[PDB]
Design a protein around this ligand. Structure first.
Ligand SMILES: O=S(=O)(O)OC[C@H]1O[C@H](O)[C@H](OS(=O)(=O)O)[C@@H](O)[C@H]1O[C@@H]1O[C@H](CO)[C@H](O)[C@H](O)[C@H]1OS(=O)(=O)O
Ligand SMILES: O=S(=O)(O)O[C@@H]1[C@@H](O)[C@@H](O)[C@@H](CO)O[C@H]1O
Ligand SMILES: [Ca+2]
Ligand SMILES: [Ca+2]
Ligand SMILES: [Cl-]
Ligand SMILES: [Cl-]
Ligand SMILES: [Cl-]
Ligand SMILES: [Cl-]
Lengths: 598, 595
């Protein structure tokens, strides 16, 4: 009476590596067979560009940013609010047998009985007769770590796919190493298709195909350089195929029954997956969920194709931090860089274990990249706007062109409205946010919704003419609210030399602010714009830092200064402070090792 | 191909009763023979001072406090998390024949097929040929109950060991009865050695000695008064001898192969036992285990002797509750008494069935004890610090000396960090904790990790000057979080008269708190500090208690008041388990009715 669900998930991979989507992608017979009686989605996206935040999104059908869960990997996992749970929990409570093999990577504390079984080898096979099932399985074959091979492999190990015929992303240098790396990733797609075929063939042999909705997708965009970790479309777009079972076509509009392979162009987001399973299972959506089912009885293909919106979020990835938000609407992609002085290339240990990332940066410093290839390593515009139909690789910023003036304002207002209404908790620094919000993020968000609107208004003053906002900005710099001073300094950093008139106030923040991150921002400004040598002060503030996250924040600032000004830092940490402890220790070790050398 | 293991376990006994460790201890030829080709550990400790929590520790290689298993005996046993099991389960699944004869006393729900056989008479003899075995056997010969003889035995039964030459612990009164009791316990060591020799001789006869690691140990410290039930070193130290089999010396560093008898001085804890068997069996540790193998190929005797840490835990023992934590590090022993208004001598029916316990209390009330002997019955310091090298019997609290200021803070911070990180679930009262956490303790701990850190911070406000924390404390007293109010009231109780200005807030807690234990703490404060007569209210609140554990907590408070204020409570009145729980309440009703 009720449908089964299967989620087949490959790690870290975007759609361009699949022949299903790209003429130069990898042949994948097993996935392509799913597509024969399936919906092939051309515009599926995660809402963030890394595993933990995307998988959190998949599970909850809600934005991690509004739940203090936007940090990979978490310093502290957050407890779920009363009225929101995971799709595996909802289904388990509805009588489904739910199995997960095996990666979770949630940024919340798990519900009790979250899965019937979640471990290596967990399977639908242990369900009682007549009991519907939900099986989720992850393959790590396409994970970023698999591209961390030694550069000598270009000579010593050959690929099955031809690197000489690789057509690279325009932001990439056209090098032997980049073509080779691309080819290596194509090879992994061939391998993971084989592996997924094992599970698909079991379902076939057991006569379950026509009772089961089978989803195949990647768990976020990636994973060549400039993708994973960024809310460019590269970090967000994923393949998505849904094989529609014959016995439950009646749950779907005739348009979507996939009697023949059917392409869908409407924008689907990871927030939509859980509500989709809920509707197919005949269960109600939670009021705290942000997504909307894309498989519904009265929803035509035309109607589904009208959907054209995706909001995306990036904050901390391992030791490296930045704050970026993306807003896609129709053909337009808008990016808001709240901290534009942080280049996307800002050092991250794990990113740069990929030899292509190191070559990319080396070529940048050797002045051998063109302007499209070098944008990754440079100071960012406060806003960028792209026409994805004309410019799918986001190479031409339209925000400074006169005919796009109205569109800039429309996208700007849309994002502001969304982030205010959510509200986006990440306008509170993690070092403050997560410890307070840990027991119930919703309670925190209700109390601080207005405060967050104020933070957003303050930082968005940096979009305006300096003289127009000068007085307002000054009052906030002198505010009694430490996080308002924080966002005011960030706006000042955005303005750069245009805010020189504030030098005395910045100096006082530098010397005397009760908040050490505020001091660090002031120091950062004076180092970037006024020749101040920040090494000693920042080293001192790191040692003085009350807790790990505050220290980590200051180390991120030291990294930005390191990269931009070519200076080394001799870092020593606070005396005052186990897979979690290993992870956290690794962040600091990564930062200390890196900063020691110019 | 794989070594066998035997655990020979005597109940309740500390090392001082063995001649192997103490010039005046009992001759025990069979254990001494084990030691001839063995490692003799001078510093082995349980992590808690009673059977069920210690045996739970032994089985799991993890702290029961982080798993809601710190309660003897359990009201409700806890289900094990997915990634943690018992050493018997791990070994059985690895193909070992596992036998237990026969005491279990686990505070978790047992795994399926936990043992190949667990019952009286279970033996390694039923293994298939070539199958390695793990045999655990307990002797009750040294159990506390054996010291529950009538005082008339001093006239009617003589001892083999000489009571006149007994050198008693300094906390004990130097009386005929204490010396006699000590001698009676020495006699039981002579007897149990003979009994364990039966098994050792079987292993010898069958040619298994040199294929088998044979462990002898007590299952926690004891059992004269002030030992079992308390996390002084008395309740924790045990003998430990491991006879190293010739055919598996190659598994150990040359230092530890015990070709001749070899003393080990490094601190060994009960959390280390299961990881040790796992390593010798070639199996991996669980990520949920806290212990570390002390028998390893690359671990030298010098390295092992560097180990110098033991954390200890005490909560409920039968009807009697208190919360105490111990932290030993190097030569220093730190004790944190979270509820210092509870004397260690707070009545427990089973403790006081030992005539020596009754005499000790009688001499206290008669003003016949010195300060070292009477500390057991008095209000406790919030913290105590001892130098075990100079002061092995923990008689001189260094926390009150100026040159130890820094050491106090170091130990204080070390314990705080440990209990925050575990996290220690026992900062939730058992009456709340075990019913909620029993299905999944790990999830509970993750969900409430910050909440526990707050509890710890709140009660540790009682370590500070009252003026400095007054405002913070008042805010918590008014908290909407019932267990924050609980720990605030406990801090206020610790402060005593110093917190008198909170009287109006306390009265309001007394009259109207939704939490009946909180009401009881307020009543307790006012009875101890403001002449309030608590009998009628507490008698009513016990009847009103929503569940047995809540009632039991309130009865513990009535016992503290009974003992300190000399007042009676008329208590009236929610299958070996049913008998056990029923006994707790009967014990409390019987005791409280008379001053
Ligand atoms: O409760 S009775 O059955 O009336 O007798 C107490 C008795 O219970 C069990 O039978 C124990 O046997 S066994 O070793 O577990 O096989 C006995 O040791 C004994 O347990 C003692 O009972 C009192 C309860 O008042 C205390 O709990 C003692 O600590 C306990 O000692 S023990 O837990 O080390 O066994
Ligand atoms: O599982 S992930 O898909 O989350 O990939 C992560 C990386 O994103 C890094 O977090 C790395 C640690 O630096 O471990 C990897 O395991
Ligand atoms: Ca992944
Ligand atoms: Ca015992
Ligand atoms: Cl891409
Ligand atoms: Cl930053
Ligand atoms: Cl002792
Ligand atoms: Cl109590």
């Amino acid at each position: 009476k009720r449908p089964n669900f299967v989620w087949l998930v490959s790690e870290d991979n975007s759609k361009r590596y699949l022949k299903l989507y790209n003429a130069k992608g990898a042949e994948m017979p097993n996935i392509e067979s799913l597509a024969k009686q399936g919906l092939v989605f051309n515009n599926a996206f995660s809402n963030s560009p890394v595993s933990s935040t995307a998988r959190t999104t998949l599970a909850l059908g809600a934005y991690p940013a509004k739940l203090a869960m936007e940090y990979h990997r978490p310093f502290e996992r957050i407890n779920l609010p009363r009225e929101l749970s995971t799709i595996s929990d909802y289904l388990t409570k509805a009588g489904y047998y739910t199995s997960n093999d095996a990666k979770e990577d949630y940024n919340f504390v798990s519900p009790e009985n979250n899965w019937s079984s979640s471990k290596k080898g967990a399977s639908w096979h242990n369900r009682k007769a007549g009991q519907p099932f939900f099986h989720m399985q992850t393959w790590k074959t396409t994970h970023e770590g698999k591209l961390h091979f030694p550069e000598s492999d270009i000579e010593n190990l050959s690929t099955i796919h031809n690197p000489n015929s690789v057509e690279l992303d325009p932001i990439h240098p056209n090098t032997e190493l980049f073509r080779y790396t691309y080819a290596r990733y194509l090879d992994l797609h061939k391998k993971v298709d084989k592996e997924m075929g094992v599970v698909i063939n079991q379902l076939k042999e057991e006569g379950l195909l026509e009772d089961t909705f089978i989803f195949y997708f990647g768990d976020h965009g990636g994973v060549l350089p400039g993708s994973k970790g960024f809310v460019s479309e590269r970090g967000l777009n994923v393949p998505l195929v849904v094989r529609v079972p014959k016995n439950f076509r009646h749950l779907l509009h005739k348009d979507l029954q996939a009697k023949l392979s059917t392409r869908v162009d409407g924008v689907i987001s990871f927030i939509d997956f859980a509500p989709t399973l809920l509707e197919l299972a005949g269960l109600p959506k939670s009021k705290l969920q942000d997504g909307e089912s894309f498989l519904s009885k009265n929803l035509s293909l035309d109607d589904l194709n009208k959907r054209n919106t995706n909001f995306s979020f990036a904050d901390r990835f391992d030791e490296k931090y930045d704050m970026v938000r993306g807003f896609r609407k129709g053909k337009y992609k808008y990016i808001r860089n709240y901290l534009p002085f942080n280049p996307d290339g800002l050092f991250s240990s794990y990113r740069y274990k990929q030899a292509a990332y190191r070559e990319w940066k080396h070529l940048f410093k050797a002045n051998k990249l063109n302007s499209v290839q070098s944008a990754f390593f440079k100071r960012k515009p406060l806003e960028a706007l792209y026409d994805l139909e004309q410019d799918p690789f986001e190479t031409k910023n339209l925000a400074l062109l006169p005919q796009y003036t109205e569109q800039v304002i429309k996208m700007r207002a849309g994002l502001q409205k969304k982030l205010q209404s959510m509200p986006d908790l990440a306008f509170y620094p993690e070092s403050y946010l997560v410890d307070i919000a840990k027991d119930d993020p919703i309670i925190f968000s209700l109390k601080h919704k207005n405060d967050i609107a104020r933070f957003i208004n303050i930082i968005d003053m940096s979009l305006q003419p300096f003289e127009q906002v000068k007085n307002k900005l000054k009052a906030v710099l002198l505010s009694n609210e430490q996080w308002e001073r924080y966002w005011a300094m960030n706006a000042v950093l955005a303005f750069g030399d245009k805010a020189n008139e504030f030098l005395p106030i910045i100096e006082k923040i530098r010397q005397s602010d009760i908040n050490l991150i505020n001091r660090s921002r002031a120091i950062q400004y004076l180092a970037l714009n006024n020749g101040v040598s920040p090494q000693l002060e920042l080293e001192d503030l790191v040692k003085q830092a009350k807790d790990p996250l505050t220290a980590l924040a200051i180390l991120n600032i030291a990294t930005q200064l390191h990269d931009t000004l070519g200076i080394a830092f001799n870092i020593e940490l606070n005396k005052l402070w186990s897979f979690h402890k290993r992870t956290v220790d690794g962040w600091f070790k990564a930062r200390m090792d890196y900063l020691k050398n110019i």
